[PDB]
Design a protein around this ligand. Sequence first.
Ligand SMILES: CNC(=O)c1cnn(C)c1C(=O)Nc1ccn2cc(-c3ccccc3)nc2n1
Ligand SMILES: [Cl-]
Ligand SMILES: [Mg+2]
Ligand SMILES: [Zn+2]
Length: 313
Amino acid sequence: GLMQFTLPVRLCKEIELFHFDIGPFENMWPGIFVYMVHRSCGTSCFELEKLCRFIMSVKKNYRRVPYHNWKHAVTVAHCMYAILQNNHTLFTDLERKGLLIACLCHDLDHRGFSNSYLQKFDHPLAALYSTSTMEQHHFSQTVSILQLEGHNIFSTLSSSEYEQVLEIIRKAIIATDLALYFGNRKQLEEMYQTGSLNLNNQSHRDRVIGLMMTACDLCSVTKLWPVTKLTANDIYAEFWAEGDEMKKLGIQPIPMMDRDKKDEVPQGQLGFYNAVAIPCYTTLTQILPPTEPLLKACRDNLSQWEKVIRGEE
Ligand SMILES: CNC(=O)c1cnn(C)c1C(=O)Nc1ccn2cc(-c3ccccc3)nc2n1
Ligand SMILES: [Cl-]
Ligand SMILES: [Mg+2]
Ligand SMILES: [Zn+2]
């Protein structure tokens, strides 16, 4: 009840900033996450005994992969926390509850491979879920952990508040399928331009929340250059292992996943910042003005990659 979590002074201050790094001490990440729920949603919204048990079961169900790991889960939750705290009044009691949990659970039991590799490998999950394969699994894994005895952090919501929040979490997690992002941003762009965008239209909220999810998920591109650069290594460690596995199936992988074409990474990041990151945080800043720091940090990192190409690093 009266058990507020407290961070050391530097974390207490820096955790409020979009570009915060949660640090290399694994055993503080749970406290950091509870700190963020308590400040974002209230000390009341979850029972601490149940939340703490949910967090540790979620941690156990992330794998020891180079990038799609427990640290990614908490990093993406922290980005959502920054967006929610900078857009205080635009989001309902339930949405804050559901989105921080969605972000923590959005990559549960990720094996380090894309939806494409599952389909070409012919993994069972690819027969169970024809599209958004890993994302339907991540949501499925979220529901399984909530149904463990003592793990229902939502127990004290009405039947209808309970169905609302599991619907928020499902849409939230599916939306991290980047193949869905391109169309979702195009529609938000069109609706903001023409003036039709209306946050009282539930189907318009859905789209906005989806872009928030893409923005939090991609937020490695919004950190200080040393963090961005060192995360890129982990991202490529998975891409290249997947390329390795493509070649074992007798398929030449795309260059992104071919460790022979490692030379061309700087140019590939340019592509990705230009085609995905910049449009994502631009459209997000238009809809939610106070998220501008994400756009500014992304532009700075674009500029840092331009300097790598030009031999200046
Ligand atoms: C920093 N975050 C990410 O990179 C990130 C995080 N989520 N997702 C999906 C990405 C991502 O798709 N990145 C891309 C996208 C296209 N690329 C093409 C190349 C490339 C080509 C030729 C030689 C070397 C590389 N590299 C790329 N990287
Ligand atoms: Cl506050
Ligand atoms: Mg994912
Ligand atoms: Zn993710």
